[PDB]
Short mmCIF file of C-alpha atoms and ligand atoms in Angstrom, two decimals:
data_model
loop_
_atom_site.label_atom_id
_atom_site.label_comp_id
_atom_site.label_asym_id
_atom_site.label_seq_id
_atom_site.Cartn_x
_atom_site.Cartn_y
_atom_site.Cartn_z
CA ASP A 1 13.28 -7.16 16.27
CA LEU A 2 13.34 -3.91 14.30
CA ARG A 3 14.35 -0.81 16.32
CA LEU A 4 12.51 2.56 16.31
CA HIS A 5 14.19 5.75 15.05
CA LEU A 6 12.26 9.04 15.15
CA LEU A 7 12.99 11.40 12.26
CA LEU A 8 15.86 13.81 12.91
CA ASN A 9 13.96 16.38 10.84
CA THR A 10 11.21 17.12 13.35
CA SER A 11 9.22 19.27 10.89
CA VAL A 12 8.10 16.01 9.22
CA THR A 13 5.32 14.89 11.57
CA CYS A 14 2.40 12.55 12.20
CA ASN A 15 -1.15 13.98 12.28
CA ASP A 16 -0.81 15.53 15.77
CA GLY A 17 2.60 17.14 15.20
CA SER A 18 4.64 14.43 16.95
CA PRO A 19 7.66 13.22 14.94
CA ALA A 20 7.22 10.51 12.34
CA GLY A 21 9.72 7.64 12.20
CA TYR A 22 10.72 4.16 11.07
CA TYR A 23 11.76 0.78 12.50
CA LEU A 24 15.02 -0.74 11.19
CA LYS A 25 16.89 -4.05 11.33
CA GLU A 26 20.18 -3.85 9.43
CA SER A 27 21.81 -6.78 7.58
CA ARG A 28 25.29 -5.42 6.93
CA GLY A 29 26.17 -8.25 4.54
CA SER A 30 23.24 -7.46 2.19
CA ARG A 31 22.72 -4.82 -0.49
CA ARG A 32 18.93 -5.35 -0.59
CA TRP A 33 16.57 -2.96 1.23
CA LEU A 34 12.85 -3.54 1.94
CA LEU A 35 10.81 -0.44 2.95
CA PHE A 36 7.26 -1.45 4.03
CA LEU A 37 4.31 1.00 4.23
CA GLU A 38 1.67 0.18 6.89
CA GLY A 39 -2.03 0.55 6.04
CA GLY A 40 -5.22 1.44 7.92
CA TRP A 41 -7.96 3.42 6.05
CA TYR A 42 -7.82 7.28 6.16
CA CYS A 43 -9.72 10.34 7.41
CA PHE A 44 -10.94 13.21 5.24
CA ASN A 45 -12.47 15.99 7.41
CA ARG A 46 -12.24 17.47 10.90
CA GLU A 47 -15.07 15.41 12.38
CA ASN A 48 -13.86 12.00 11.19
CA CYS A 49 -10.19 12.76 11.98
CA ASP A 50 -11.22 13.74 15.55
CA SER A 51 -12.95 10.37 16.02
CA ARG A 52 -9.92 8.49 14.66
CA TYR A 53 -7.73 10.33 17.22
CA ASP A 54 -9.81 8.96 20.11
CA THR A 55 -9.75 5.28 19.20
CA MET A 56 -7.07 4.81 16.48
CA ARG A 57 -4.40 7.11 17.87
CA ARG A 58 -1.37 4.98 16.94
CA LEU A 59 -2.35 5.78 13.30
CA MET A 60 -2.19 9.54 14.08
CA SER A 61 0.72 9.94 16.51
CA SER A 62 4.08 8.51 17.64
CA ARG A 63 3.57 9.34 21.33
CA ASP A 64 2.76 5.72 22.27
CA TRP A 65 4.90 3.72 19.77
CA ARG A 66 10.79 0.91 20.95
CA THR A 67 10.82 -2.36 18.94
CA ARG A 68 8.62 -4.48 16.62
CA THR A 69 8.99 -8.08 15.44
CA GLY A 70 9.41 -8.59 11.69
CA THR A 71 6.79 -10.95 10.22
CA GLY A 72 6.17 -12.44 6.77
CA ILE A 73 8.28 -10.62 4.17
CA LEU A 74 9.84 -8.65 7.09
CA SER A 75 11.01 -11.85 8.85
CA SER A 76 14.75 -12.59 8.97
CA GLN A 77 14.16 -16.38 9.21
CA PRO A 78 14.30 -18.33 5.91
CA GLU A 79 11.67 -20.73 7.30
CA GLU A 80 9.13 -17.85 7.43
CA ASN A 81 10.58 -15.73 4.57
CA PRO A 82 11.95 -17.80 1.66
CA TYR A 83 12.17 -14.66 -0.53
CA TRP A 84 14.28 -11.93 1.17
CA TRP A 85 15.21 -13.20 4.68
CA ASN A 86 18.74 -11.67 4.52
CA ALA A 87 17.62 -8.14 3.51
CA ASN A 88 17.80 -4.89 5.45
CA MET A 89 14.26 -4.51 6.90
CA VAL A 90 12.34 -1.22 7.41
CA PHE A 91 8.75 -0.83 8.69
CA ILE A 92 7.36 2.71 8.23
CA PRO A 93 4.31 3.30 10.49
CA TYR A 94 1.25 4.95 8.92
CA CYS A 95 0.53 8.05 11.02
CA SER A 96 -0.69 10.53 8.36
CA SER A 97 -4.20 9.19 7.52
CA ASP A 98 -3.82 10.34 3.89
CA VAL A 99 -3.05 7.16 1.88
CA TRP A 100 0.60 8.36 1.92
CA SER A 101 -0.25 11.30 -0.39
CA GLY A 102 -0.21 14.39 1.82
CA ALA A 103 2.11 17.40 1.88
CA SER A 104 0.59 19.75 4.46
CA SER A 105 1.86 20.89 7.88
CA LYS A 106 -0.13 21.68 11.00
CA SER A 107 -0.54 25.47 11.12
CA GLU A 108 -2.84 28.31 12.18
CA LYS A 109 -5.25 27.09 9.43
CA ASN A 110 -4.75 23.30 9.79
CA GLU A 111 -5.68 21.38 12.96
CA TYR A 112 -3.81 18.29 11.65
CA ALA A 113 -0.69 17.68 9.53
CA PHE A 114 -0.97 15.35 6.50
CA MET A 115 2.61 14.56 5.48
CA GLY A 116 2.66 10.98 4.13
CA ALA A 117 4.47 11.81 0.87
CA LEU A 118 7.09 13.82 2.79
CA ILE A 119 7.53 11.10 5.45
CA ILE A 120 8.58 8.62 2.75
CA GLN A 121 11.07 11.12 1.28
CA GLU A 122 12.61 11.89 4.68
CA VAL A 123 12.96 8.20 5.64
CA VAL A 124 14.84 7.47 2.39
CA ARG A 125 17.05 10.51 3.05
CA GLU A 126 18.05 9.48 6.58
CA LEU A 127 18.57 5.84 5.56
CA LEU A 128 21.14 6.93 2.94
CA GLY A 129 23.51 7.74 5.79
CA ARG A 130 22.82 4.40 7.51
CA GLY A 131 23.77 1.97 4.71
CA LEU A 132 21.21 2.55 1.94
CA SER A 133 23.89 4.39 -0.07
CA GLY A 134 25.41 0.97 -0.80
CA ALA A 135 22.17 -0.70 -1.94
CA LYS A 136 21.59 -2.51 -5.22
CA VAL A 137 17.78 -2.87 -4.92
CA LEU A 138 15.25 -0.81 -2.92
CA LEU A 139 11.85 -2.55 -2.83
CA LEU A 140 9.07 -0.18 -1.66
CA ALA A 141 6.29 -2.48 -0.36
CA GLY A 142 3.00 -1.92 1.45
CA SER A 143 -0.39 -3.36 2.41
CA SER A 144 -3.92 -1.95 1.90
CA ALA A 145 -3.66 1.87 2.20
CA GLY A 146 0.11 1.24 2.13
CA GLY A 147 -0.26 -0.70 -1.14
CA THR A 148 -1.99 2.28 -2.74
CA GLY A 149 0.84 4.38 -1.24
CA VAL A 150 3.37 2.26 -3.18
CA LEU A 151 1.58 3.13 -6.45
CA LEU A 152 1.54 6.84 -5.55
CA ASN A 153 5.17 7.08 -4.38
CA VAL A 154 7.44 4.51 -6.11
CA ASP A 155 8.37 6.79 -9.05
CA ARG A 156 9.00 9.67 -6.61
CA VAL A 157 11.52 7.58 -4.65
CA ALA A 158 13.21 6.69 -7.96
CA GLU A 159 13.44 10.36 -8.96
CA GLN A 160 14.74 11.32 -5.48
CA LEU A 161 17.62 8.82 -5.63
CA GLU A 162 18.57 9.93 -9.15
CA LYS A 163 18.67 13.58 -8.07
CA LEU A 164 20.77 12.71 -5.01
CA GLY A 165 23.41 11.07 -7.22
CA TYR A 166 22.50 7.36 -6.88
CA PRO A 167 21.16 6.45 -10.35
CA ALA A 168 22.37 2.81 -10.10
CA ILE A 169 20.14 1.71 -7.19
CA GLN A 170 17.18 -0.18 -8.66
CA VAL A 171 13.84 1.05 -7.25
CA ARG A 172 10.86 -1.36 -7.48
CA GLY A 173 7.37 -1.58 -5.97
CA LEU A 174 5.26 -4.29 -4.31
CA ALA A 175 1.61 -3.26 -3.81
CA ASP A 176 -0.46 -5.66 -1.64
CA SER A 177 -4.25 -5.23 -1.32
CA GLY A 178 -4.23 -1.65 -2.67
CA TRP A 179 -5.68 -2.23 -6.18
CA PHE A 180 -9.30 -1.00 -5.88
CA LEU A 181 -12.10 -0.59 -8.46
CA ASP A 182 -14.33 2.49 -8.77
CA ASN A 183 -17.10 0.04 -9.68
CA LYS A 184 -20.90 0.05 -9.32
CA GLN A 185 -21.88 -0.60 -5.70
CA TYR A 186 -24.27 -3.35 -4.56
CA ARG A 187 -26.32 -0.80 -2.56
CA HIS A 188 -25.97 3.00 -2.75
CA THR A 189 -25.85 5.95 -0.32
CA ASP A 190 -25.31 9.64 -1.07
CA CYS A 191 -22.09 11.06 0.40
CA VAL A 192 -23.31 12.75 3.57
CA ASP A 193 -20.98 11.55 6.38
CA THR A 194 -18.12 9.09 6.84
CA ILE A 195 -20.00 5.81 6.41
CA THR A 196 -22.10 6.85 3.38
CA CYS A 197 -19.29 8.34 1.25
CA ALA A 198 -18.05 6.15 -1.60
CA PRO A 199 -14.26 6.10 -2.15
CA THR A 200 -14.37 8.31 -5.27
CA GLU A 201 -16.10 11.12 -3.35
CA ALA A 202 -14.16 10.61 -0.09
CA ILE A 203 -10.79 10.71 -1.91
CA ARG A 204 -11.78 13.83 -3.87
CA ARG A 205 -12.46 15.59 -0.54
CA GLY A 206 -9.37 14.08 1.09
CA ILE A 207 -7.02 15.35 -1.62
CA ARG A 208 -8.19 18.92 -0.93
CA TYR A 209 -8.02 18.47 2.88
CA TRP A 210 -4.53 16.86 2.76
CA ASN A 211 -2.98 18.85 -0.09
CA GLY A 212 -2.47 15.41 -1.60
CA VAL A 213 0.05 14.70 -4.37
CA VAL A 214 -0.16 12.12 -7.18
CA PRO A 215 2.45 10.95 -9.73
CA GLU A 216 3.24 13.56 -12.37
CA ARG A 217 2.37 11.61 -15.55
CA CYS A 218 -0.98 10.50 -14.12
CA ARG A 219 -1.70 14.07 -12.97
CA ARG A 220 -0.99 15.34 -16.51
CA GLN A 221 -3.50 12.85 -17.97
CA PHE A 222 -6.43 13.57 -15.63
CA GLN A 223 -5.64 17.25 -14.83
CA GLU A 224 -6.81 19.66 -12.11
CA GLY A 225 -9.77 18.47 -10.04
CA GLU A 226 -9.56 14.84 -11.27
CA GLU A 227 -6.49 13.68 -9.33
CA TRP A 228 -8.68 11.18 -7.42
CA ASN A 229 -8.40 8.92 -10.49
CA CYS A 230 -4.72 8.27 -9.68
CA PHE A 231 -5.66 6.50 -6.42
CA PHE A 232 -7.13 3.61 -8.51
CA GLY A 233 -4.49 1.07 -9.50
CA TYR A 234 -5.71 0.20 -13.00
CA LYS A 235 -5.56 3.95 -13.93
CA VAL A 236 -2.24 4.91 -12.28
CA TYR A 237 -0.22 1.73 -13.05
CA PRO A 238 0.16 2.36 -16.84
CA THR A 239 1.75 5.74 -16.04
CA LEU A 240 4.53 4.31 -13.82
CA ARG A 241 8.07 3.68 -14.99
CA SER A 242 9.40 1.62 -12.04
CA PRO A 243 8.71 -2.15 -12.04
CA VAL A 244 5.68 -2.93 -9.83
CA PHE A 245 4.39 -6.37 -8.79
CA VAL A 246 0.67 -6.36 -7.81
CA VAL A 247 -0.75 -8.69 -5.12
CA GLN A 248 -4.58 -8.58 -4.93
CA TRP A 249 -7.20 -11.00 -3.63
CA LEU A 250 -9.93 -11.28 -6.28
CA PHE A 251 -12.69 -10.85 -3.64
CA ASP A 252 -10.99 -8.36 -1.34
CA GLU A 253 -12.88 -7.68 1.90
CA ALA A 254 -12.17 -3.93 1.85
CA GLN A 255 -13.46 -3.70 -1.74
CA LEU A 256 -16.65 -5.52 -0.70
CA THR A 257 -17.06 -3.16 2.28
CA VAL A 258 -16.84 -0.07 0.05
CA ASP A 259 -19.34 -1.80 -2.29
CA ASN A 260 -21.81 -2.03 0.65
CA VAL A 261 -21.71 -5.86 0.73
CA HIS A 262 -21.75 -7.81 4.01
CA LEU A 263 -21.12 -11.57 3.91
CA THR A 264 -22.72 -13.02 7.04
CA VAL A 265 -26.59 -15.85 -1.02
CA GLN A 266 -29.35 -15.24 -3.55
CA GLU A 267 -29.09 -14.64 -7.29
CA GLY A 268 -28.51 -10.87 -7.29
CA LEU A 269 -25.58 -11.01 -4.88
CA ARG A 270 -24.18 -14.16 -6.51
CA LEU A 271 -24.02 -12.34 -9.84
CA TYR A 272 -22.52 -9.23 -8.19
CA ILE A 273 -19.71 -11.20 -6.53
CA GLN A 274 -18.89 -13.17 -9.69
CA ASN A 275 -18.82 -9.94 -11.71
CA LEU A 276 -16.38 -8.37 -9.21
CA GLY A 277 -13.93 -11.25 -9.63
CA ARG A 278 -14.26 -11.07 -13.42
CA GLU A 279 -13.63 -7.30 -13.48
CA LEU A 280 -10.61 -7.55 -11.16
CA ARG A 281 -9.15 -10.35 -13.27
CA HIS A 282 -9.71 -8.24 -16.40
CA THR A 283 -7.75 -5.27 -14.99
CA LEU A 284 -4.73 -7.55 -14.31
CA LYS A 285 -4.68 -9.15 -17.79
CA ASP A 286 -1.73 -6.99 -18.94
CA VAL A 287 0.10 -6.71 -15.59
CA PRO A 288 3.09 -9.08 -16.11
CA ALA A 289 4.10 -9.31 -12.40
CA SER A 290 1.00 -10.16 -10.34
CA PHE A 291 -0.43 -12.66 -7.82
CA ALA A 292 -4.24 -12.76 -7.54
CA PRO A 293 -5.96 -15.70 -5.78
CA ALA A 294 -9.71 -16.41 -5.72
CA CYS A 295 -10.20 -15.80 -1.99
CA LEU A 296 -12.19 -13.56 0.36
CA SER A 297 -9.41 -11.95 2.46
CA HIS A 298 -7.46 -8.72 2.99
CA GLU A 299 -3.64 -8.22 3.10
CA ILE A 300 -0.95 -10.91 2.97
CA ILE A 301 2.72 -9.93 2.75
CA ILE A 302 3.43 -9.39 6.49
CA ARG A 303 1.37 -12.40 7.67
CA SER A 304 3.49 -15.19 9.12
CA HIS A 305 1.60 -17.81 7.06
CA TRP A 306 1.95 -15.87 3.78
CA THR A 307 3.80 -18.91 2.38
CA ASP A 308 0.69 -21.12 2.33
CA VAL A 309 -1.41 -19.76 -0.54
CA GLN A 310 -0.66 -20.86 -4.12
CA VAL A 311 -1.98 -20.05 -7.62
CA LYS A 312 -1.49 -22.73 -10.31
CA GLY A 313 0.82 -24.48 -7.82
CA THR A 314 3.15 -21.48 -7.21
CA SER A 315 3.46 -19.65 -3.86
CA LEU A 316 3.84 -15.87 -3.45
CA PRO A 317 7.48 -16.07 -2.19
CA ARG A 318 8.31 -18.20 -5.25
CA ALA A 319 6.61 -15.73 -7.63
CA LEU A 320 8.61 -12.86 -6.09
CA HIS A 321 11.84 -14.86 -6.52
CA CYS A 322 10.91 -15.44 -10.18
CA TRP A 323 10.33 -11.68 -10.54
CA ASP A 324 13.87 -11.06 -9.23
CA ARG A 325 15.27 -13.49 -11.82
CA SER A 326 13.24 -11.84 -14.60
CA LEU A 327 14.81 -8.45 -13.76
CA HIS A 328 18.42 -9.67 -14.11
CA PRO A 329 9.55 -16.06 -19.47
CA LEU A 330 11.37 -18.64 -17.31
CA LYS A 331 10.79 -22.41 -17.32
CA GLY A 332 8.82 -23.37 -14.22
CA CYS A 333 9.31 -19.88 -12.70
CA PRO A 334 6.22 -17.77 -13.45
CA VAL A 335 5.61 -14.13 -12.53
CA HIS A 336 1.94 -13.58 -13.68
CA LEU A 337 -0.41 -15.73 -11.54
CA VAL A 338 -4.15 -14.90 -11.64
CA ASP A 339 -6.85 -17.41 -10.68
CA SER A 340 -9.73 -18.07 -13.08
CA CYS A 341 -12.28 -19.86 -10.91
CA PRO A 342 -15.30 -17.66 -10.12
CA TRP A 343 -16.15 -17.93 -6.37
CA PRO A 344 -14.33 -17.24 -3.04
CA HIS A 345 -12.43 -20.35 -1.83
CA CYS A 346 -12.55 -22.14 -5.19
CA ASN A 347 -8.77 -22.17 -4.62
CA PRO A 348 -8.21 -24.73 -1.81
CA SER A 349 -5.14 -22.88 -0.49
CA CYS A 350 -7.15 -19.79 0.56
CA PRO A 351 -6.72 -18.63 4.18
CA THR A 352 -9.28 -19.85 6.70
C1 T3T B 401 4.07 15.00 21.36
C2 T3T B 401 3.59 15.98 20.50
C3 T3T B 401 2.21 16.16 20.39
C4 T3T B 401 1.36 15.36 21.14
C5 T3T B 401 -0.16 15.54 21.04
N1 T3T B 401 -0.68 16.40 22.10
C6 T3T B 401 -2.14 16.55 22.01
C7 T3T B 401 -2.50 17.33 20.74
C8 T3T B 401 -2.25 18.70 20.64
C9 T3T B 401 -2.58 19.39 19.47
C10 T3T B 401 -3.18 18.69 18.39
C11 T3T B 401 -3.43 17.35 18.49
C12 T3T B 401 -3.10 16.67 19.68
O1 T3T B 401 -4.02 16.90 17.29
C13 T3T B 401 -3.96 17.97 16.38
O2 T3T B 401 -3.61 19.12 17.11
N2 T3T B 401 1.85 14.44 21.96
C14 T3T B 401 3.16 14.25 22.08
C1 T3T B 402 -6.13 -1.67 6.23
C2 T3T B 402 -7.49 -1.88 6.20
C3 T3T B 402 -8.27 -1.15 5.33
C4 T3T B 402 -7.64 -0.22 4.51
C5 T3T B 402 -8.50 0.60 3.54
N1 T3T B 402 -7.82 0.92 2.29
C6 T3T B 402 -7.85 2.36 2.09
C7 T3T B 402 -8.46 2.69 0.72
C8 T3T B 402 -9.77 2.30 0.44
C9 T3T B 402 -10.34 2.59 -0.80
C10 T3T B 402 -9.58 3.29 -1.77
C11 T3T B 402 -8.29 3.67 -1.50
C12 T3T B 402 -7.71 3.37 -0.23
O1 T3T B 402 -7.79 4.33 -2.64
C13 T3T B 402 -8.66 4.02 -3.69
O2 T3T B 402 -9.89 3.71 -3.09
N2 T3T B 402 -6.34 -0.02 4.57
C14 T3T B 402 -5.56 -0.72 5.39
C1 NAG B 403 12.92 19.02 6.76
O1 NAG B 403 11.70 18.63 6.12
C2 NAG B 403 11.04 19.67 5.39
C3 NAG B 403 9.74 19.09 4.87
O2 NAG B 403 9.96 18.28 3.72
C4 NAG B 403 11.96 20.17 4.28
O3 NAG B 403 11.33 21.25 3.59
C5 NAG B 403 13.28 20.64 4.87
O4 NAG B 403 14.17 21.01 3.83
C6 NAG B 403 13.91 19.54 5.72
N1 NAG B 403 15.13 20.02 6.34
C7 NAG B 403 16.28 19.33 6.36
C8 NAG B 403 17.44 20.00 7.04
O5 NAG B 403 16.37 18.22 5.84
#
């Protein structure tokens, strides 16, 4: 079990003004620290944030959060977690609805606070008095909206630790299921409410509503008004300096949802699905640390059975171990693992 701590700086809040926080299980014999960012979509105007508050309130508030069990990469049992079972474990709940990008407080002009980027900074700060000052590696991990949050925030955590006087701690990222394409959709709707708004248009509006922040080098490339581009992995990744390992299902269910596809198959859709896998594979060609199986799924790293899937005979925990060794090719220890077969479940190890 990981134990809840609410932030001592109570100006750093969830959407409704309640304090943000983190869950922690220390391993005092270890100098490795895993900070995991939870996912769960986003909201981008008053009307859709109000709805989310009624039926997804744990993603907007800490009022109803004392312990949580660590699973997958957050498990302390080597049977479930062959990679980092002895590490210090931190789960950061997603209560800002902003893809971890926001820097805006609730105020006379703002019904909600969007503080995701500041929540990450404050967690790192408070952890530095609880053992993180002695770390050798800080791995910032996350799933779905939390995976995109890794891409947006990993270089900011690295800069923070350097400016606080800890330049020797190695900061790295692990982004799971947060590598999306701004691709052509299977069917199209003009952006008129929540359901009809494609991600490019919803994120453009969100950035303005949240006062969202993107990494500096990416921001300098795309410039004012085009920051939405930095929420797309293939565009932001080449601007990052920290090492980042990318986990992405080739036929991700959230990607298919935003593409207006429902699987529940004739030539047009067959060609669309095969083209999506081909395009995703293409964007990972020059990503040296990656794991991308040919499956229809969403998320993996905190699932208890995350050990089961394999690409070219190598599991995800093994690939992450090989990544560690590479940061000290390697015979029998690969780090770039992308499937090449063209249809969901052409890999027999895909989840059922
Ligand atoms: C501690 C602190 C705050 C709360 C929430 N209380 C209801 C509420 C008030 C104002 C709001 C809001 C919700 O959403 C945006 O503005 N609970 C426990
Ligand atoms: C659990 C389930 C579903 C989700 C949705 N992921 C958010 C998202 C979607 C499209 C995006 C994006 C972020 O940034 C680029 O385009 N998260 C967690
Ligand atoms: C509390 O958090 C706010 C928001 O980032 C920051 O401006 C302020 O300096 C923090 N105060 C302390 C004492 O850490």
